[PDB]
Amino acid sequence: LGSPIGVFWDIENCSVPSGRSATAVVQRIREKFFKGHREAEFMCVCDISKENKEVIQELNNCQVTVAHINATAKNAADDKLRQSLRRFANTHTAPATVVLVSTDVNFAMELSDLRHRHGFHIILVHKNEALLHHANELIRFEEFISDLPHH
């Protein structure tokens, strides 16, 4: 009902296929999820020195925040995703929707907090049960990267 939505994208693990339009992936996510909502956040975490520069430019043209971390710390991206989920939850109240685009079961408890103590609607976009259990909705990441337009 005009409730806020935040998208948090683990793009290291749910990546855009080589040669394909990241713009189209972002468009598909927004088309699937954003009707009736106000966008509070749409962010991905990555080490931009590892990522395809054209993909990153597409993301910035699509107004997806590209939060840079140094991936030589193996838990840096996961930590930043957790912190961003929590920051979203810190100043919004139910009703609100979190879309986590990740397959990292490491987020289980985060989602539990968001579901139980914050009362948020949780959509997990994953590649595939402990992680799935706390989500309200489970969507396969594949539908957002299948048969994409090519560069």
Side-chain angles (χ1 to χ4, degrees), residues 111-149:
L111 303 182
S112 171
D113 284 5
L114 292 167
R115 167 157 200 178
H116 280 112
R117 291 193 299 97
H118 295 269
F120 293 175
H121 185 73
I122 307 303
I123 305 176
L124 178 75
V125 175
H126 60 95
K127 304 201 285 193
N128 190 276
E129 208 269 357
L131 176 67
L132 311 157
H133 174 266
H134 290 290
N136 299 89
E137 294 183 56
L138 304 166
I139 305 298
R140 289 168 63 258
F141 181 61
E142 181 73 7
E143 82 170 70
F144 300 107
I145 61 155
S146 62
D147 188 41
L148 283 166

Coordinates of all heavy atoms in Angstrom, one line a residue, residues 111-149:
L111 N 17.3 -12.6 8.1 CA 15.9 -12.7 7.6 C 15.0 -12.9 8.8 O 13.9 -12.3 8.9 CB 15.7 -13.7 6.5 CG 16.7 -13.5 5.3 CD1 16.4 -14.5 4.3 CD2 16.5 -12.1 4.8
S112 N 15.4 -13.8 9.7 CA 14.5 -14.1 10.9 C 14.3 -12.8 11.7 O 13.1 -12.4 11.9 CB 15.2 -15.1 11.8 OG 14.5 -15.1 13.1
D113 N 15.3 -12.0 11.9 CA 15.1 -10.7 12.6 C 14.1 -9.9 11.8 O 13.1 -9.4 12.3 CB 16.4 -9.9 12.7 CG 17.3 -10.5 13.8 OD1 17.0 -11.5 14.5 OD2 18.4 -9.9 14.1
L114 N 14.4 -9.7 10.5 CA 13.5 -8.9 9.7 C 12.1 -9.3 9.6 O 11.2 -8.5 9.6 CB 14.1 -8.8 8.3 CG 15.5 -8.1 8.1 CD1 16.1 -8.4 6.7 CD2 15.3 -6.6 8.3
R115 N 11.9 -10.7 9.7 CA 10.6 -11.2 9.6 C 9.9 -11.0 11.0 O 8.7 -10.6 11.1 CB 10.6 -12.6 9.2 CG 9.2 -13.3 9.4 CD 9.1 -14.5 8.5 NE 7.7 -14.9 8.3 CZ 7.2 -15.8 7.6 NH1 8.1 -16.5 6.8 NH2 6.0 -16.1 7.5
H116 N 10.6 -11.3 12.0 CA 9.9 -11.4 13.3 C 9.9 -10.1 14.1 O 8.9 -9.6 14.4 CB 10.5 -12.6 14.1 CG 10.1 -13.9 13.7 ND1 10.9 -14.8 13.1 CD2 8.8 -14.5 13.7 CE1 10.2 -15.9 12.8 NE2 8.9 -15.7 13.2
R117 N 11.1 -9.5 14.3 CA 11.1 -8.3 15.1 C 10.7 -7.1 14.3 O 10.2 -6.1 14.9 CB 12.5 -8.2 15.8 CG 12.7 -9.3 16.8 CD 13.9 -9.1 17.7 NE 15.1 -9.0 17.0 CZ 15.7 -7.9 16.6 NH1 15.2 -6.8 16.9 NH2 16.8 -8.0 15.9
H118 N 11.0 -7.1 13.0 CA 10.6 -5.9 12.2 C 9.3 -6.1 11.5 O 8.7 -5.1 11.0 CB 11.7 -5.6 11.2 CG 13.0 -5.1 11.9 ND1 13.2 -3.8 12.2 CD2 14.0 -5.8 12.4 CE1 14.4 -3.7 12.8 NE2 14.9 -4.9 12.9
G119 N 8.8 -7.3 11.4 CA 7.5 -7.6 10.7 C 7.5 -7.3 9.2 O 6.5 -7.0 8.6
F120 N 8.7 -7.4 8.6 CA 8.8 -7.1 7.1 C 8.4 -8.3 6.3 O 8.6 -9.5 6.7 CB 10.2 -6.7 6.7 CG 10.7 -5.4 7.3 CD1 12.0 -5.0 7.1 CD2 9.8 -4.6 8.0 CE1 12.5 -3.7 7.6 CE2 10.3 -3.3 8.5 CZ 11.6 -2.9 8.3
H121 N 8.0 -8.1 5.1 CA 7.8 -9.1 4.1 C 9.1 -9.4 3.4 O 9.8 -8.5 2.9 CB 6.7 -8.6 3.1 CG 6.3 -9.6 2.1 ND1 5.5 -10.7 2.4 CD2 6.6 -9.8 0.8 CE1 5.3 -11.4 1.3 NE2 6.0 -10.9 0.3
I122 N 9.5 -10.7 3.4 CA 10.8 -11.1 3.0 C 10.6 -11.9 1.7 O 10.0 -13.0 1.7 CB 11.5 -12.0 4.0 CG1 11.5 -11.3 5.4 CG2 12.9 -12.3 3.6 CD1 12.2 -9.9 5.4
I123 N 11.3 -11.4 0.6 CA 11.4 -12.1 -0.6 C 12.8 -12.5 -0.9 O 13.7 -11.6 -0.9 CB 10.9 -11.3 -1.8 CG1 9.4 -10.8 -1.5 CG2 10.9 -12.0 -3.1 CD1 8.9 -9.8 -2.6
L124 N 13.1 -13.8 -1.0 CA 14.4 -14.3 -1.2 C 14.5 -14.7 -2.7 O 13.7 -15.6 -3.1 CB 14.7 -15.5 -0.3 CG 16.1 -16.1 -0.5 CD1 17.2 -15.2 0.0 CD2 16.2 -17.5 0.1
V125 N 15.4 -14.1 -3.5 CA 15.7 -14.5 -4.8 C 17.0 -15.3 -4.8 O 18.0 -14.7 -4.5 CB 15.8 -13.2 -5.7 CG1 16.2 -13.7 -7.2 CG2 14.5 -12.5 -5.7
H126 N 16.9 -16.6 -5.1 CA 18.0 -17.5 -4.8 C 18.2 -18.4 -6.0 O 17.4 -18.5 -6.9 CB 17.6 -18.3 -3.6 CG 16.4 -19.1 -3.8 ND1 16.4 -20.4 -4.1 CD2 15.1 -18.8 -3.7 CE1 15.2 -20.9 -4.3 NE2 14.3 -19.9 -4.0
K127 N 19.3 -19.2 -5.9 CA 19.6 -20.3 -6.8 C 19.5 -21.7 -6.2 O 19.7 -22.6 -6.9 CB 21.0 -20.1 -7.4 CG 21.2 -18.7 -8.0 CD 22.4 -18.7 -9.0 CE 23.7 -18.6 -8.3 NZ 24.8 -18.3 -9.4
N128 N 19.1 -21.8 -4.9 CA 18.9 -23.0 -4.3 C 20.1 -24.0 -4.4 O 20.7 -24.3 -3.4 CB 17.6 -23.8 -4.8 CG 17.3 -25.0 -4.0 OD1 17.8 -26.1 -4.1 ND2 16.3 -24.8 -3.0
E129 N 17.5 -25.1 3.1 CA 16.1 -24.8 3.5 C 16.1 -23.8 4.7 O 15.1 -23.1 5.0 CB 15.3 -26.1 3.9 CG 13.8 -26.0 3.7 CD 13.1 -25.5 4.9 OE1 13.7 -25.3 6.0 OE2 11.8 -25.3 4.8
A130 N 17.2 -23.8 5.4 CA 17.4 -22.9 6.6 C 17.3 -21.4 6.1 O 16.7 -20.6 6.8 CB 18.7 -23.1 7.3
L131 N 17.8 -21.1 4.9 CA 17.7 -19.8 4.4 C 16.3 -19.6 3.8 O 15.7 -18.5 4.0 CB 18.7 -19.6 3.2 CG 18.7 -18.3 2.5 CD1 19.1 -17.1 3.3 CD2 19.6 -18.4 1.2
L132 N 15.7 -20.6 3.2 CA 14.4 -20.4 2.6 C 13.3 -20.3 3.7 O 12.3 -19.6 3.4 CB 14.1 -21.6 1.7 CG 15.2 -22.0 0.7 CD1 15.0 -23.5 0.3 CD2 15.1 -21.1 -0.5
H133 N 13.5 -20.9 4.9 CA 12.4 -21.0 5.8 C 11.9 -19.7 6.3 O 10.7 -19.5 6.4 CB 12.9 -21.8 7.0 CG 12.0 -21.9 8.2 ND1 12.0 -21.0 9.2 CD2 10.9 -22.8 8.4 CE1 11.0 -21.3 10.1 NE2 10.4 -22.4 9.6
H134 N 12.8 -18.7 6.6 CA 12.3 -17.4 7.1 C 11.8 -16.5 6.0 O 11.2 -15.4 6.4 CB 13.5 -16.7 7.8 CG 13.9 -17.4 9.1 ND1 13.1 -17.3 10.2 CD2 15.0 -18.1 9.4 CE1 13.7 -18.0 11.2 NE2 14.8 -18.5 10.7
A135 N 11.9 -16.8 4.8 CA 11.3 -16.0 3.7 C 9.8 -16.2 3.6 O 9.3 -17.3 3.8 CB 12.0 -16.2 2.4
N136 N 9.1 -15.1 3.3 CA 7.7 -15.2 2.9 C 7.6 -15.7 1.5 O 6.7 -16.5 1.2 CB 7.0 -13.9 3.1 CG 7.0 -13.3 4.5 OD1 8.0 -12.7 4.9 ND2 6.0 -13.7 5.3
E137 N 8.4 -15.3 0.6 CA 8.4 -15.7 -0.8 C 9.7 -16.2 -1.3 O 10.8 -15.6 -0.9 CB 7.9 -14.6 -1.7 CG 6.5 -14.1 -1.6 CD 6.2 -13.0 -2.6 OE1 6.3 -13.3 -3.8 OE2 5.8 -11.9 -2.2
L138 N 9.8 -17.2 -2.1 CA 11.0 -17.7 -2.7 C 10.9 -17.7 -4.2 O 10.0 -18.2 -4.8 CB 11.2 -19.2 -2.3 CG 11.3 -19.4 -0.8 CD1 11.1 -20.9 -0.5 CD2 12.6 -18.9 -0.2
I139 N 11.8 -17.0 -4.8 CA 11.8 -16.8 -6.3 C 13.2 -17.2 -6.8 O 14.2 -17.0 -6.2 CB 11.6 -15.3 -6.7 CG1 10.3 -14.8 -6.1 CG2 11.6 -15.1 -8.2 CD1 9.1 -15.5 -6.5
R140 N 13.2 -18.0 -7.9 CA 14.5 -18.4 -8.5 C 15.1 -17.3 -9.2 O 14.5 -16.5 -9.9 CB 14.2 -19.6 -9.4 CG 13.9 -20.9 -8.7 CD 13.4 -22.0 -9.7 NE 14.4 -22.4 -10.6 CZ 14.4 -22.0 -11.9 NH1 13.5 -21.1 -12.4 NH2 15.4 -22.4 -12.7
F141 N 16.4 -17.1 -8.9 CA 17.1 -16.0 -9.6 C 17.1 -16.2 -11.1 O 17.2 -15.3 -11.9 CB 18.6 -16.0 -9.1 CG 19.4 -14.9 -9.7 CD1 19.1 -13.6 -9.6 CD2 20.6 -15.3 -10.5 CE1 19.9 -12.6 -10.2 CE2 21.4 -14.3 -11.1 CZ 21.0 -13.0 -10.9
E142 N 17.0 -17.5 -11.5 CA 17.1 -17.8 -13.0 C 16.1 -17.0 -13.8 O 16.5 -16.6 -14.9 CB 16.8 -19.3 -13.2 CG 17.0 -19.7 -14.6 CD 18.4 -19.8 -15.1 OE1 19.3 -19.6 -14.3 OE2 18.6 -20.0 -16.3
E143 N 14.9 -16.7 -13.3 CA 14.0 -16.0 -14.2 C 14.4 -14.6 -14.5 O 14.0 -14.1 -15.6 CB 12.6 -16.0 -13.5 CG 12.4 -14.9 -12.5 CD 10.9 -14.8 -12.1 OE1 10.4 -15.8 -11.5 OE2 10.3 -13.8 -12.5
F144 N 15.3 -14.0 -13.7 CA 15.8 -12.7 -14.0 C 17.0 -12.7 -14.9 O 17.4 -11.6 -15.4 CB 16.2 -12.0 -12.7 CG 15.0 -11.8 -11.8 CD1 14.9 -12.6 -10.6 CD2 14.0 -11.0 -12.1 CE1 13.9 -12.5 -9.8 CE2 12.9 -10.8 -11.2 CZ 12.9 -11.6 -10.1
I145 N 17.6 -13.9 -15.2 CA 18.8 -13.9 -16.1 C 18.6 -14.8 -17.2 O 19.6 -15.1 -18.0 CB 20.1 -14.2 -15.3 CG1 20.0 -15.6 -14.7 CG2 20.4 -13.1 -14.3 CD1 21.3 -16.2 -14.5
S146 N 17.4 -15.4 -17.4 CA 17.2 -16.3 -18.5 C 16.9 -15.5 -19.8 O 16.0 -14.6 -19.8 CB 16.0 -17.3 -18.2 OG 14.8 -16.5 -18.0
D147 N 17.5 -15.9 -20.9 CA 17.3 -15.3 -22.2 C 17.3 -13.8 -22.2 O 16.4 -13.1 -22.6 CB 15.9 -15.8 -22.8 CG 15.7 -15.4 -24.2 OD1 16.7 -15.5 -25.0 OD2 14.6 -15.1 -24.6
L148 N 18.4 -13.3 -21.7 CA 18.6 -11.8 -21.6 C 18.9 -11.2 -22.9 O 19.6 -11.9 -23.7 CB 19.7 -11.5 -20.5 CG 19.3 -11.6 -19.1 CD1 20.6 -11.6 -18.3 CD2 18.4 -10.5 -18.6
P149 N 18.6 -10.0 -23.1 CA 19.2 -9.2 -24.3 C 20.7 -9.2 -24.1 O 21.2 -9.2 -23.0 CB 18.5 -7.8 -24.1 CG 17.3 -8.0 -23.2 CD 17.7 -9.1 -22.3

